[PDB]
Scaffold this active site. Structure first.
Site, mmCIF file in Angstrom:
data_model
loop_
_atom_site.group_PDB
_atom_site.id
_atom_site.type_symbol
_atom_site.label_atom_id
_atom_site.label_comp_id
_atom_site.label_asym_id
_atom_site.label_seq_id
_atom_site.Cartn_x
_atom_site.Cartn_y
_atom_site.Cartn_z
ATOM 1 N N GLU A 23 0.841 -1.191 0.000
ATOM 2 C CA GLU A 23 0.000 0.000 0.000
ATOM 3 C C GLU A 23 0.878 1.242 0.000
ATOM 4 O O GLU A 23 1.793 1.344 0.827
ATOM 5 C CB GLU A 23 -0.931 0.014 1.213
ATOM 6 C CG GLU A 23 -2.303 0.649 0.974
ATOM 7 C CD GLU A 23 -3.077 0.857 2.264
ATOM 8 O OE1 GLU A 23 -2.446 1.120 3.304
ATOM 9 O OE2 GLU A 23 -4.320 0.763 2.244
ATOM 10 N N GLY A 35 3.043 2.881 10.990
ATOM 11 C CA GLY A 35 2.684 2.386 12.303
ATOM 12 C C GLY A 35 2.177 0.962 12.244
ATOM 13 O O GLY A 35 2.581 0.112 13.038
ATOM 14 N N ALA A 36 1.314 0.674 11.270
ATOM 15 C CA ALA A 36 0.788 -0.671 11.077
ATOM 16 C C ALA A 36 0.127 -0.756 9.715
ATOM 17 O O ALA A 36 -0.224 0.258 9.113
ATOM 18 C CB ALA A 36 -0.210 -1.062 12.164
ATOM 19 N N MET A 37 -0.048 -1.990 9.244
ATOM 20 C CA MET A 37 -0.694 -2.279 7.973
ATOM 21 C C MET A 37 -1.815 -3.284 8.198
ATOM 22 O O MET A 37 -1.852 -3.988 9.209
ATOM 23 C CB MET A 37 0.305 -2.814 6.948
ATOM 24 C CG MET A 37 0.447 -1.934 5.719
ATOM 25 S SD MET A 37 -1.106 -1.333 5.017
ATOM 26 C CE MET A 37 -1.785 -2.810 4.266
ATOM 27 N N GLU A 38 -2.746 -3.325 7.244
ATOM 28 C CA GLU A 38 -3.992 -4.069 7.375
ATOM 29 C C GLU A 38 -4.053 -5.338 6.525
ATOM 30 O O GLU A 38 -5.130 -5.923 6.402
ATOM 31 C CB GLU A 38 -5.160 -3.161 6.999
ATOM 32 C CG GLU A 38 -5.109 -2.718 5.542
ATOM 33 C CD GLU A 38 -5.531 -1.278 5.348
ATOM 34 O OE1 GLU A 38 -5.009 -0.396 6.062
ATOM 35 O OE2 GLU A 38 -6.359 -1.028 4.447
ATOM 36 N N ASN A 39 -2.937 -5.743 5.910
ATOM 37 C CA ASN A 39 -2.883 -6.897 5.008
ATOM 38 C C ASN A 39 -3.726 -8.064 5.510
ATOM 39 O O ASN A 39 -3.515 -8.552 6.620
ATOM 40 C CB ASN A 39 -1.435 -7.339 4.831
ATOM 41 C CG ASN A 39 -0.554 -6.239 4.272
ATOM 42 O OD1 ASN A 39 -0.149 -5.338 4.997
ATOM 43 N ND2 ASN A 39 -0.303 -6.277 2.969
ATOM 44 N N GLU A 84 -6.493 -1.493 13.156
ATOM 45 C CA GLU A 84 -6.130 -2.498 12.163
ATOM 46 C C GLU A 84 -7.244 -3.510 11.950
ATOM 47 O O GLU A 84 -7.515 -3.931 10.819
ATOM 48 C CB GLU A 84 -4.848 -3.197 12.598
ATOM 49 C CG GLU A 84 -3.590 -2.367 12.422
ATOM 50 C CD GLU A 84 -3.688 -1.306 11.342
ATOM 51 O OE1 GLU A 84 -3.306 -0.154 11.612
ATOM 52 O OE2 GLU A 84 -4.063 -1.635 10.199
ATOM 53 N N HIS A 131 -10.098 -2.455 9.584
ATOM 54 C CA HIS A 131 -9.801 -2.531 8.158
ATOM 55 C C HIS A 131 -10.184 -3.872 7.561
ATOM 56 O O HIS A 131 -10.548 -3.946 6.383
ATOM 57 C CB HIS A 131 -8.329 -2.254 7.908
ATOM 58 C CG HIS A 131 -7.977 -0.804 7.885
ATOM 59 N ND1 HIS A 131 -8.706 0.128 7.181
ATOM 60 C CD2 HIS A 131 -6.978 -0.122 8.494
ATOM 61 C CE1 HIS A 131 -8.153 1.318 7.332
ATOM 62 N NE2 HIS A 131 -7.109 1.196 8.130
ATOM 63 N N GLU A 160 -9.843 4.599 5.591
ATOM 64 C CA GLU A 160 -9.176 5.089 6.790
ATOM 65 C C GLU A 160 -10.137 5.922 7.629
ATOM 66 O O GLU A 160 -10.111 5.855 8.862
ATOM 67 C CB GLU A 160 -7.954 5.919 6.397
ATOM 68 C CG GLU A 160 -7.139 5.326 5.250
ATOM 69 C CD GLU A 160 -6.403 4.060 5.591
ATOM 70 O OE1 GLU A 160 -5.990 3.920 6.753
ATOM 71 O OE2 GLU A 160 -6.245 3.203 4.697
HETATM 72 N N1 LIG Z 1 -3.281 3.253 5.747
HETATM 73 C C1 LIG Z 1 -2.551 2.220 6.452
HETATM 74 C C2 LIG Z 1 -1.044 2.354 6.230
HETATM 75 C C3 LIG Z 1 -0.755 3.213 5.007
HETATM 76 S S1 LIG Z 1 0.659 4.279 5.378
HETATM 77 S S2 LIG Z 1 -0.026 5.797 6.656
HETATM 78 C C4 LIG Z 1 1.374 6.648 7.434
HETATM 79 C C5 LIG Z 1 2.092 5.847 8.528
HETATM 80 C C6 LIG Z 1 2.452 6.768 9.693
HETATM 81 O O1 LIG Z 1 3.500 7.300 9.648
HETATM 82 N N2 LIG Z 1 1.537 6.968 10.814
HETATM 83 C C7 LIG Z 1 1.822 7.795 11.971
HETATM 84 C C8 LIG Z 1 2.816 6.982 12.795
HETATM 85 C C9 LIG Z 1 2.401 5.882 13.545
HETATM 86 C C10 LIG Z 1 3.306 5.135 14.281
HETATM 87 C C11 LIG Z 1 4.640 5.476 14.271
HETATM 88 C C12 LIG Z 1 5.058 6.559 13.525
HETATM 89 C C13 LIG Z 1 4.169 7.323 12.785
HETATM 90 C C14 LIG Z 1 4.673 8.517 11.973
HETATM 91 C C15 LIG Z 1 5.347 9.572 12.850
HETATM 92 O O2 LIG Z 1 6.261 9.250 13.659
HETATM 93 O O3 LIG Z 1 4.984 10.776 12.754
HETATM 94 N N3 LIG Z 1 1.367 4.722 9.105
HETATM 95 C C16 LIG Z 1 0.072 4.871 9.749
HETATM 96 O O4 LIG Z 1 -0.469 5.919 9.810
HETATM 97 C C17 LIG Z 1 -0.642 3.696 10.373
HETATM 98 C C18 LIG Z 1 -2.089 3.919 9.972
HETATM 99 C C19 LIG Z 1 -2.963 3.099 10.904
HETATM 100 C C20 LIG Z 1 -3.188 3.863 12.206
HETATM 101 C C21 LIG Z 1 -2.797 3.341 13.352
HETATM 102 C C22 LIG Z 1 -3.040 4.109 14.649
HETATM 103 C C23 LIG Z 1 -3.634 5.279 14.624
HETATM 104 O O5 LIG Z 1 -3.849 5.974 15.814
HETATM 105 C C24 LIG Z 1 -4.088 5.880 13.298
HETATM 106 C C25 LIG Z 1 -3.883 5.225 12.176
HETATM 107 N N4 LIG Z 1 -2.115 3.511 8.579
HETATM 108 C C26 LIG Z 1 -2.779 2.374 7.946
HETATM 109 O O6 LIG Z 1 -3.462 1.580 8.498
HETATM 110 ZN ZN LIG Z 2 -5.403 2.634 8.393
#
Ligand SMILES: N[C@H]1CCSSC[C@@H](C(=O)NCc2ccccc2CC(=O)O)NC(=O)C[C@H](Cc2ccc(O)cc2)NC1=O
Ligand SMILES: [Zn+2]
Ligand SMILES: *[C@@H]1O[C@H](CO)[C@@H](O[C@@H]2O[C@H](CO)[C@@H](O[C@@H]3O[C@H](CO)[C@@H](O)[C@H](O)[C@@H]3O)[C@H](O)[C@H]2NC(C)=O)[C@H](O)[C@H]1NC(C)=O
Ligand SMILES: *[C@@H]1O[C@H](CO)[C@@H](O[C@@H]2O[C@H](CO)[C@@H](O)[C@H](O)[C@H]2NC(C)=O)[C@H](O)[C@H]1NC(C)=O
Ligand SMILES: *[C@@H]1O[C@H](CO)[C@@H](O[C@@H]2O[C@H](CO)[C@@H](O)[C@H](O)[C@H]2NC(C)=O)[C@H](O)[C@H]1NC(C)=O
Ligand SMILES: *[C@@H]1O[C@H](CO)[C@@H](O[C@@H]2O[C@H](CO)[C@@H](O)[C@H](O)[C@H]2NC(C)=O)[C@H](O)[C@H]1NC(C)=O
Ligand SMILES: *[C@@H]1O[C@H](CO)[C@@H](O)[C@H](O)[C@H]1NC(C)=O
Ligand SMILES: *[C@@H]1O[C@H](CO)[C@@H](O)[C@H](O)[C@H]1NC(C)=O
Ligand SMILES: *[C@@H]1O[C@H](CO)[C@@H](O)[C@H](O)[C@H]1NC(C)=O
Ligand SMILES: *[C@@H]1O[C@H](CO)[C@@H](O)[C@H](O)[C@H]1NC(C)=O
Ligand SMILES: *[C@@H]1O[C@H](CO)[C@@H](O)[C@H](O)[C@H]1NC(C)=O
Length: 856
Positions: A139, A267-271, A304, A307, A326
């Site tokens: 993704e 942070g995490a993926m939903e695979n 997760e 999703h 999302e």
């Molecule tokens: N869409 C899919 C993945 C597509 S990549 S999204 C961009 C990337 C990202 O950096 N997030 C912010 C983050 C989170 C942890 C550690 C560092 C950082 C960045 C920082 O240090 O600033 N990951 C995600 O956001 C995961 C989020 C699922 C999610 C979980 C918990 C939440 O409370 C809200 C949302 N995403 C999904 O499921």
């Molecule tokens: Zn997500």
């Protein structure tokens, strides 16, 4: 390359449609290389002579066309464009409508060094033997690189993965394994799912699992930290039983596998069947993890799991409706928490995230949650706060305006009707309207929210027993607003009503002359409310008298709104600061933090600008408001979670600006902790605050650095890392960013973290922007242009600039890069952020020094 490529558009042709993919790959971690074979079952519903696929970074050896009556296979010619990352297969003898064919392509590639697609890395053990791990991040558009496919989410298909392992590794994917010199494991055939949900992992792992009313929930992890997976399973099993009851569709896979990846950027993926995670995010240890750390792992697992139904099962037709996944997941993430995990007080983060999302949305750089997306970079920027939290507010607003039960019916019908299918924005709205066939016509009410920038501004004027309401756009075409107002009568009795505004102006009838109002019930509405000065003054008096008539959510929404309104010049700054005088009667976290973020934001801006004098005057006046609450804080990990994080914020605030005894006490605790070689128990809440104080010492800074390399508690290390980066020795700060960037000693995933922390404070403020600026193309190689990671970096280091001179340089620098880069939203948004900082400095700085003075 004789003839040119047969397709001239970014998006794939709809003639070809895949049915079944066979992916058998063989990877060598030593050389970071693999061999893969893709067999595709394709039906063409159109009379076509050419077949187009998405493929990049691939060595192709041979391709087969084989759907003749008895022909075994036929060799074919492959063409590549590479600007669009597309390849064309000129198949001999044109495909007929409704006729199924089978295409197999042979290829070789490398494991990438970037954080994307199929990647590998080397990590060091407790016994200190290098080990290797391979992971997947397809993704959004990384599947192209992995194997040749139709890399678009609408092209759902079944998948069978056949993977080969080097020794006796753990080979995992979506479906359970049934395969028996190096071993080859073939996973079972899966549901019709998109290409980007394909996932496979290869590394040395151990498993902890439980049965969940039929399915086996397995939480995998690296042998080192397998004891830290106890909390994740506790919540994961509890959540799955909760989610299966509110969506009557049950989990469709035999095994649910959650894995903790050593590196991994997202942070995490939903695979599907393979939740890939960050080790910091999934692992937990009560002894070494904070309350916020317990809350972070809970929400991500909750997020997760949602999703699995929103996105895995039923997914967006195209990314321009990414908020359809999302946005639903984030809504379902915090909704699930509020029913089964109310202790955590998770409404606070949702509020704060919406406050922060509404500021980005209010900018002219913002787009509708359903917005045309064409370029690859345009797709990458769809993972922004709007998709997560403006799509989540839109859902939240409907639940409060409509009933809670109706939402369940709209949700359940939505999932069944569109199961294993691609959905659109309008598809979701009919579902609400389907279960509620009244005079509502939801699709017209939500068309305003999903097709235009920003949110309305509700201006409220009270004269006599009439509430006058007008809707205006927020800046420094008409929506249907669900207004909800809380009134207090003259006998101070609670009375609440709700109304819908579909017109520019309005008048709401009041039963009795009231004392005051609140125009948004909690947050619950995606809009900002401005009141008449007397009505504004009415609210302030009540707040100065008794703040508990309102909510904490309702009182912190008033603070975010008044300052936001105060920032743009709608209302004088003093009145915003005049409200925040009730802090003496304040014991709840949400009002305290949003006030603290508003004061912390102002202080950081001034400190950058050389106004050391004014800045400390500001935090002093706020410290005196919260002097009672701050002073009674104990460093003891005591109290219900909302109380626990309430402590850290105050301890951080006093220590960060050297206020009171916080520094005096924290130095003693750190010396105690340091003179115990990290053995002595130091409370989780005060760890980050103490580490920040300890890092000021060069020995403390160096001692901490030894621990970070030494300990295995990922949650405890990110607390320590925050301390190292909050150091004022510019030489120390620079090295931290160079280490993560290259990845030695510091993992590259923290680069965004280190750059953001370095840029906050005065030492290294210039350092952070320059390192991003001067290392920009190395940054674009690691994370794609338009990615959250690179958009986080730009915004992380540019939000504290307030000068026209500074505005001219950021604008000029991106001009120096390229037209594709300069048209990016991150560049455009973050430049406009600087602009507004110039104006805020203009309108309120001069007067701020007036309220901020010592009058004889
Ligand atoms: N869409 C899919 C993945 C597509 S990549 S999204 C961009 C990337 C990202 O950096 N997030 C912010 C983050 C989170 C942890 C550690 C560092 C950082 C960045 C920082 O240090 O600033 N990951 C995600 O956001 C995961 C989020 C699922 C999610 C979980 C918990 C939440 O409370 C809200 C949302 N995403 C999904 O499921
Ligand atoms: Zn997500
Ligand atoms: C189950 O799913 C189907 C397909 O998603 C839903 O059908 C959709 O129903 C809506 C009703 O508003 C149709 O919208 C209509 O479109 C025409 C013009 O395009 C317009 O004149 C109508 O006023 C309305 O806007 C929509 O077309 C239709 N889906 C498709 C693909 O045509 C169905 O309602 C869902 N729920 C059930 C069956 O309970
Ligand atoms: C990948 O290649 C490496 C060598 O470049 C293989 O590693 C060693 O291979 C030899 C012969 O195959 C063995 O005798 C060694 O014991 C292996 N040891 C180590 C620690 O790697 C490796 O097996 C190959 N793996 C795959 C999946 O092809
Ligand atoms: C004290 O406040 C309450 C809030 O509910 C008042 O209750 C209602 O007040 C409105 C405004 O006067 C009337 O329209 C309703 O009919 C009242 N409810 C009844 C009469 O059952 C309440 O009346 C106030 N106390 C008084 C007026 O003595
Ligand atoms: C303090 O803890 C550190 C580890 O954080 C110790 O350093 C390691 O100690 C282990 C035994 O626990 C030795 O086998 C290693 O050789 C040490 N590593 C390094 C890098 O030196 C240290 O011994 C502890 N105490 C003191 C006073 O140093
Ligand atoms: C990686 O593999 C691709 C595809 O085989 C090949 O073009 C390239 O030479 C290898 N890597 C790089 C960075 O050049
Ligand atoms: C691709 O395969 C061909 C033929 O086997 C070979 O000549 C070439 O070196 C390979 N490319 C890469 C990047 O391995
Ligand atoms: C291809 O197989 C599918 C299996 O679902 C069948 O529906 C279809 O009839 C086959 N192709 C043709 C042209 O009939
Ligand atoms: C790991 O997977 C196996 C597969 O049969 C399972 O039976 C076992 O219970 C799991 N390990 C645990 C729960 O420790
Ligand atoms: C320590 O905290 C108390 C709490 O009121 C404060 O009065 C005192 O001034 C602080 N000590 C200092 C500033 O030396």
């Amino acid at each position: 390359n004789g003839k040119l490529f047969p397709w001239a558009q970014i998006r794939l042709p709809t003639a070809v449609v895949p049915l079944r993919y066979e992916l058998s790959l063989h990877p060598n971690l030593t050389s970071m290389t693999f061999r893969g074979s893709v067999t595709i079952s394709v039906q063409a519903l159109q009379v076509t002579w050419n077949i187009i696929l998405h493929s990049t970074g691939h060595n192709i050896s041979r391709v087969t066309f084989m759907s003749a009556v008895s022909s075994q296979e036929k060799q074919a010619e492959i063409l590549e464009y590479a600007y669009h990352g597309q390849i064309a297969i000129v198949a001999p003898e044109a495909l007929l409508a409704g006729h199924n064919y089978t295409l197999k392509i042979e290829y070789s590639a490398n494991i990438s060094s970037s954080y994307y697609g199929f990647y590998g890395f080397s990590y060091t053990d407790e016994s200190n033997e290098k080990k290797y791990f391979a992971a997947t991040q397809f993704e959004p558009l990384a599947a192209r690189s992995a194997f040749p496919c139709f890399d678009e989410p609408a092209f759902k298909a079944t998948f069978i993965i056949k993977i080969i392992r080097d020794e006796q590794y753990t080979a995992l994917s979506n479906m359970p394994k049934k395969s028996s010199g190096l071993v080859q494991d073939e996973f079972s055939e899966s549901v019709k799912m998109s290409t980007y949900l394909v996932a496979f992992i290869v590394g040395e792992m151990k498993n902890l699992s439980q049965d969940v009313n039929g399915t086996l929930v397995s939480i995998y992890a690296v042998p080192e930290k397998i004891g830290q997976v106890h909390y994740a399973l506790e919540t994961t099993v509890k959540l799955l039983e909760f989610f299966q009851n509110y969506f009557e569709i049950q989990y469709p896979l035999k095994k649910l596998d959650l894995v903790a990846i050593p590196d991994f950027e997202a942070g995490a993926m939903e695979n599907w069947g393979l939740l890939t995670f960050r080790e910091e995010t999934l692992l937990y240890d009560s002894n070494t993890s904070s309350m916020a750390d317990r809350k972070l792992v809970t929400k991500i697992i909750a997020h997760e799991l949602a999703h699995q139904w929103f996105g895995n099962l039923v997914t967006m037709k195209w990314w321009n409706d990414l908020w359809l996944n999302e946005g639903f997941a984030t809504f379902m993430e915090y909704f699930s928490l509020e029913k089964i995990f109310k202790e955590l007080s998770s409404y606070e983060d949702f509020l704060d995230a919406r406050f922060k999302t509404m500021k980005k949305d209010s900018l002219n750089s913002s787009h509708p949650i359903s917005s045309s997306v064409q370029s690859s970079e345009q797709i990458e920027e769809m993972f922004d706060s709007l998709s997560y939290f403006k799509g989540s507010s839109l859902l939240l607003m409907l639940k409060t305006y409509l009933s809670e039960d109706v939402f369940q019916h709209a949700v359940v019908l939505y999932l069944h009707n569109h199961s294993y299918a691609s959905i659109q924005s309008d598809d979701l709205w009919d579902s609400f309207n389907e279960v509620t066939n009244q005079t509502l016509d939801v699709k017209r009410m939500m068309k305003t929210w999903t097709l235009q920038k920003g949110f309305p501004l509700v201006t409220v004027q009270k004269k006599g027993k009439e509430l006058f309401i007008q809707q205006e756009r927020f800046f420094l075409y008409l929506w249907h607003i669900p207004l909800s107002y809380v009134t207090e009568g003259r006998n101070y009795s609670k009375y609440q009503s709700v109304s819908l505004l579909d017109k520019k102006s309005g008048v709401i009838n009041l039963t009795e002359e009231v004392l005051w109002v609140k125009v948004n019930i909690n947050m619950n509405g995606y809009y900002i409310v401005h009141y008449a000065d007397d009505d504004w003054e009415a609210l302030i008096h009540q707040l100065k008298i008794n703040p508990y008539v309102l909510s904490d959510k309702d009182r912190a929404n008033l603070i975010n709104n008044i300052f936001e309104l105060a920032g743009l010049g709608k209302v004088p700054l003093k009145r915003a600061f005049d409200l925040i005088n009730y802090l003496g009667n304040e014991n709840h976290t949400a009002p305290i933090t949003e006030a603290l973020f508003q004061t912390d934001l102002i202080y950081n801006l001034l400190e950058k600008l050389g106004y050391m004098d004014l800045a400390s005057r500001l935090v002093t006046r706020v410290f005196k408001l919260l002097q009672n609450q701050i002073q009674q804080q104990t460093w003891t990990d005591e109290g219900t979670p909302s109380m626990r994080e309430l402590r850290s914020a105050l301890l951080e605030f006093a220590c960060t600006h050297n206020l009171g005894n916080c520094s005096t006490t924290a130095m003693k605790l750190f010396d105690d902790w340091m003179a115990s070689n990290g053995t002595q128990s130091l409370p989780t809440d005060v760890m980050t605050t103490v580490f920040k104080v300890g890092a000021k010492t060069d020995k403390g800074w160096s001692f901490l650095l030894g621990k970070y390399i030494s300990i295995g508690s990922e949650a405890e290390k990110n607390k320590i890392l925050e301390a190292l980066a909050s150091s004022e020795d510019v030489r120390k700060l620079y090295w931290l960013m160079k280490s993560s960037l290259n990845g030695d000693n510091f993992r590259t995933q923290k680069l965004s973290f280190i750059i953001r922390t370095v840029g906050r404070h005065f030492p290294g403020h210039l350092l952070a922007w320059d390192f991003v600026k001067e290392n920009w193309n190395k940054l674009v190689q690691k994370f794609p242009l338009g990615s959250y990671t690179i958009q986080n970096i730009v915004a992380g280091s540019t939000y504290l600039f307030s000068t026209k001179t500074h505005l001219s340089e950021v604008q000029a620098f991106f001009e120096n890069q390229s037209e594709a880069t300069f048209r990016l939203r991150c560049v455009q948004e973050a430049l406009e952020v600087i602009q507004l900082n110039i104006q805020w400095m203009e309108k309120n700085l001069k007067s701020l020094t007036w309220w901020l003075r010592t009058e004889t």
